[PDB]
Amino acid sequence: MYDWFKQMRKESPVYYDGKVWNLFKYEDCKMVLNDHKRFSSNLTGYNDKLEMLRSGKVFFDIPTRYTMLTSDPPLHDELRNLTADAFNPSNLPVDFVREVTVKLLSELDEEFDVIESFAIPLPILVISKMLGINPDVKKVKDWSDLVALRLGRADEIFSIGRKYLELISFSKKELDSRKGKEIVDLTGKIANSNLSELEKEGYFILLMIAGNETTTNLIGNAIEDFTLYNSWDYVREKGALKAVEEALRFSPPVMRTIRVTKEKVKIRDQVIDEGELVRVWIASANRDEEVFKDPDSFIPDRTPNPHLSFGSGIHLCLGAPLARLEARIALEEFAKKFRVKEIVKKEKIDNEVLNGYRKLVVRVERT
Numbered sequence: 001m002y003d004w005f006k007q008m009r010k011e012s013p014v015y016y017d018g019k020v021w022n023l024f025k026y027e028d029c030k031m032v033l034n035d036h037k038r039f040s041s042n043l044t045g046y047n048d049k050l051e052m053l054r055s056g057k058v059f060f061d062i063p064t065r066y067t068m069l070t071s072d073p074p075l076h077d078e079l080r081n082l083t084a085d086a087f088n089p090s091n092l093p094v095d096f097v098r099e100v101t102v103k104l105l106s107e108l109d110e111e112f113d114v115i116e117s118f119a120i121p122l123p124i125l126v127i128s129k130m131l132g133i134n135p136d137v138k139k140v141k142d143w144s145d146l147v148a149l150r151l152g153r154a155d156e157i158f159s160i161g162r163k164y165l166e167l168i169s170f171s172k173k174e175l176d177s178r179k180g181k182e183i184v185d186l187t188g189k190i191a192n193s194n195l196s197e198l199e200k201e202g203y204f205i206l207l208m209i210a211g212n213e214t215t216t217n218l219i220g221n222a223i224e225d226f227t228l229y230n231s232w233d234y235v236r237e238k239g240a241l242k243a244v245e246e247a248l249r250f251s252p253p254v255m256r257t258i259r260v261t262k263e264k265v266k267i268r269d270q271v272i273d274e275g276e277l278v279r280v281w282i283a284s285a286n287r288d289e290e291v292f293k294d295p296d297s298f299i300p301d302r303t304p305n306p307h308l309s310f311g312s313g314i315h316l317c318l319g320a321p322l323a324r325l326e327a328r329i330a331l332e333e334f335a336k337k338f339r340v341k342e343i344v345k346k347e348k349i350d351n352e353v354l355n356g357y358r359k360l361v362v363r364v365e366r367t
């Protein structure tokens with residue numbers, strides 16, 4: 001789609017596709033993301049029925065409609081503050097991340113799929129630790145995909161089934177079991193907060209799912225990019241701090257996000273009415289030639305590197321510090337342990353929003 005993006009950036013940067021407005025230019029995307037007053041995230045009615053929720057009124061709905069991701073301040077800020085400290089660099093479980101990474105890599109043969117054997121389990125084990133739940137990896141992965149793989153698919157991520165009910169019941173079981181028992185981990189903090197049961201479930205589910213899906217894509221995308229563009233020696237000698245940022249820019253785990261206008265606005269020469277949906281194409285913004293010279297070139301030491309892969313503004317990814325830490329440790333440990341001979345087989349995830357490999361088989365040599 002990068003060709004489409006390039007074609008759209010030059011001839012129709014602010015484009016209406018018949019249902020929603022699409023932004024392909026970096027500056028337009030950054031502006032929209034930072035301007036939360038005019039471009040709301042209140043896309044699921046969370047802010048509107050907050051009063052109803054806190055009153056004690058119970059109605060059947062899917063928890064995922066009630067998370068900080070789709071809320072405007074002050075509610076948004078109040079929600080984020082509940083767990084924000086736990087995601088600050090100084091509080092991340094650094095040793096645990098490294099320990100799990102090394103053990104996962106110890107179980108590998110000269111040829112393996114880095115997605116199922118490494119990229120998938122690492123984030124799941126780490127977020128489970130922070131949540132304080134005992135990680136049934138396969139189960140958590142299945143639920144994560146159940147929710148994540150519905151993104152882009154019109155109104156399905158809010159549709160419920162047997163597997164979704166299983167997820168909601170698990171969230172309720174975990175939360176209820178920690179209510180009145182502990183507030184040391186994320187589950188306990190949510191459970192003992194003053195939010196409605198439905199909000200607690202959504203908050204818990206958000207942290208568990210957003211906590212691994214995109215990080216798996218980042219690690220897999222980076223292993224692919226570093227191999228293809230021969231960045232491994234650079235990472236072994238300099239570390240992966242800048243390389244991870246280029247991987248984020250070049251292969252964004254999340255291709256786009258969305259907002260809804262709260263008032264009539266004008267972007268470039270286009271007038272957009274109140275209540276209209278606006279797709280912010282992070283992927284296209286990251287390849288905007290204006291902002292990124294040699295946009296299609298993978299330059300691991302690109303500096304500075306202001307990509308929008310984690311968003312921008314008040315919704316800037318709460319897990320950004322954690323994701324970068326996991327990716328940095330995963331890739332540096334991988335580089336130290338293996339010499340990638342070749343990418344044997346690769347298969348992309350079929351989704352419009354999530355960008356990554358569902359299978360990436362590599363042949364390596366010890367050292």
Ligand code: HEM
Nearest residue numbers: 068069210211214215253257309310311315317318319323
């Ligand atoms: C690993 C690659 C990741 C990427 C590329 C990514 C990207 C993003 C983006 C773009 C947003 C904002 C979406 C919007 O503005 O509508 C967001 C929000 C959020 N992310 Fe991530 N994320 C990643 C990992 C994680 C992880 C690991 C966690 C938790 C472990 C996490 C927790 C959250 C939360 C809670 C929000 C909501 C923030 C709020 O609305 O203020 N993310 N992420």
